């Protein structure tokens, strides 16, 4: 496994729920970067350098993912709820003495991020979310066309062991199919092969895959309900926020419903903005987080 | 594999699209029985003897299922569309000299059946559908709770070879889990173990699995488009119809009967205490309901 972060340290950060693994580089105001599925912190390898020109950059494995520890789940999937993951990451940032920080997330990491902003807005100076809408909104959108396009939200959420049994037969195929499927190219050409190997190695462990299904189960159940409470209470994120989305991945209209100070832009990209479109993504993040 | 229809004959019926395998028995008016997923013709073995006391019973493997031939599919999943399957079975019944017949279907076979009624009503005296709503209605009703409850429609419809790869690792565990999950009890108790072994053997063949995924791909795309034309046109099935469903089955807020009255101008229906698999979970009632409906 390659080291894709030149001049970044490696840290295991203790919390009440388990260690968080992170690469740590740069100096300046703090900025936490959060990956999603089916990836690890390594998905920021092409944009983290440019950000570390200006910021202290903490590139973390989500709870249960990568090299972060795997908290024991329960019947409500609690530790893989976005609320619980945000709590845990707030504790990890406290271990570094960071109680007010900038945050960027992609995919599941972006869900942790907007949940963090809704639960504990005082922790954040600014927030960016990459190629997501809120979990509640994707579910409200779940008609035939969405059921088909985002099938994994229902499949990965089926009760255990149904997805875990299926994924065990050829995990490398499934992780690669997901990576490829959501890019513009439709193949793995946007990805550094070294990064792909990190994603494959993680995905090859049955325990890591179970956690991913627990995350999707939370996505179907508790995370949806948590979001529902906020949309019913009329709660909006007050933190200044950026919504980036892939031309092939209006979103800004959705996020204006959820957030009182939001700006946004498309990027010519599939889902995987930091790897498909690293210059445009890095440029937009530096410009937002600098201001 | 066991013979679950002792005394019934066996026919391999040629058609332009491929052979249809069937068991044939009884005497009287012709009645075609069509299974669905993940099963074969054997799922009728508990009701067939009873129906055979009053009808000439033709128990057919769907195109691509069981021992029927597997046509090569295409980008629109054509041979595994219900419209194509109906055409094919019309041909198979004409090889037997049946141009006007009664029909009962379950699951995919029920979908073939109502599409056959929409396309070619003159072929049918009467039709019964077991534990389904129209494909259009499944999709239109889609929301978070239905997506989570019945996920396989969207999963198996993913582009090849994604479901095929995932199902190839441990096919037995998937087929058996589906069978159990859809019953009232949630286990395999309702099924004769010899019938389970027919289903398992069929499912163990990668080609048969690919057919089942093409059937669900048709279900997500062309079948859905064919139904949408009909419902947007206000076309109703004119053939007298029965809708039977399981109280704990797969088939809406509205009862299934109320869904079907939108699609059919002469429809009756009833629930049975059962999961999805009416002819195995509730054979006596299912047989009774059918004999009464088709004999009236
Ligand atoms: Ca002939
Ligand atoms: Cl996501
Ligand atoms: Cl999203
Ligand atoms: Cl249905
Ligand atoms: Cl019964």
Swiss-Prot record, chain B:
The protein's matches in Pfam families, at most eight in alphabetical order, are given as: Abhydrolase_1
List membrane-spanning regions: none
Gene3D superfamilies documented for this protein? alpha/beta hydrolase
**UniProt effect for mutating residue 153 to H:** Reduced catalytic rate. Reduced substrate affinity
Q: Which residues form the signal peptide?
A: none
| Top-level taxon | Bacteria
Residues covered by the AB hydrolase-1 domain: 29-266
Annotated keywords: Hydrolase
Positions of the site: Important for enzyme activity?
131
Q: What is its EC number?
A: 3.8.1.3
Question: Under the GO molecular function aspect, what terms does this record hold?
Answer: haloacetate dehalogenase activity
Q: Does the keyword Hydrolase apply?
A: yes
Catalyzed chemical reaction(s): a haloacetate + H2O = a halide anion + glycolate + H(+); fluoroacetate + H2O = fluoride + glycolate + H(+); chloroacetate + H2O = glycolate + chloride + H(+)
Q: Does the keyword tRNA-binding apply?
A: no
Q: Which residues form the active site?
A: 107, 276
The residues the record assigns to binding fluoroacetate are 108, 111, 152-153, 216
Q: How does it assemble?
A: Homodimer.
Q: Name the job this protein performs.
A: Catalyzes the hydrolytic defluorination of fluoroacetate to produce glycolate. Has lower activity towards chloroacetate and bromoacetate.
Please state which protein family the record places this protein in: Belongs to the AB hydrolase superfamily. Epoxide hydrolase family.
Protein's name in the database: Fluoroacetate dehalogenase
């Amino acid at each position: 496994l390659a080291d894709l972060f030149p001049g970044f340290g490696s840290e295991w950060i203790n919390t009440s729920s388990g260690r968080i693994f992170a690469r740590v580089g740069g100096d300046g105001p703090p900025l936490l970067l959060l990956h999603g599925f089916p990836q690890t912190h390594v998905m920021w390898h092409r944009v983290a350098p440019k950000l570390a020109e200006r910021f202290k950059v903490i590139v973390a494995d989500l709870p249960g993912y990568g090299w972060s520890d795997m908290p024991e789940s329960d019947e409500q999937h609690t530790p893989y709820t976005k609320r619980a993951m945000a709590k845990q990451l707030i504790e990890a940032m406290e271990q570094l003495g960071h109680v007010h920080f900038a945050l960027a997330g992609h995919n599941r990491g972006a869900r942790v991020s907007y949940r963090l902003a809704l639960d504990s807005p005082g922790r954040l100076s600014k927030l960016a979310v990459l190629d997501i809408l809120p979990t509640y909104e994707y579910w409200q959108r779940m008609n035939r066309a969405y059921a088909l396009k985002i099938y994994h939200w229902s499949f990965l959420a089926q009760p255990a062991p149904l997805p875990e049994n299926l994924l065990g037969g050829d995990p490398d195929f499934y992780v690669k199919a997901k990576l490829a499927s959501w890019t513009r190219a439709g193949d793995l050409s946007a990805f550094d092969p070294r990064a792909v190997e990190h994603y494959r190695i993680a995905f090859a462990d049955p325990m890591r895959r179970h956690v991913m299904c627990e995350d999707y189960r939370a996505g179907a159940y508790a995370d949806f309900e948590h979001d529902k409470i906020d949309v019913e209470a009329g709660n909006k994120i007050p933190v200044p926020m950026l919504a980036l989305w892939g031309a092939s991945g209006t979103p800004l209209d959705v996020w204006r419903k959820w957030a009182s100070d939001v700006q946004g832009a498309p990027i010519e990209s599939g889902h995987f903005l930091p790897e498909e479109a690293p210059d445009q993504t890095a440029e937009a993040l530096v410009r937002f987080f600098s201001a």
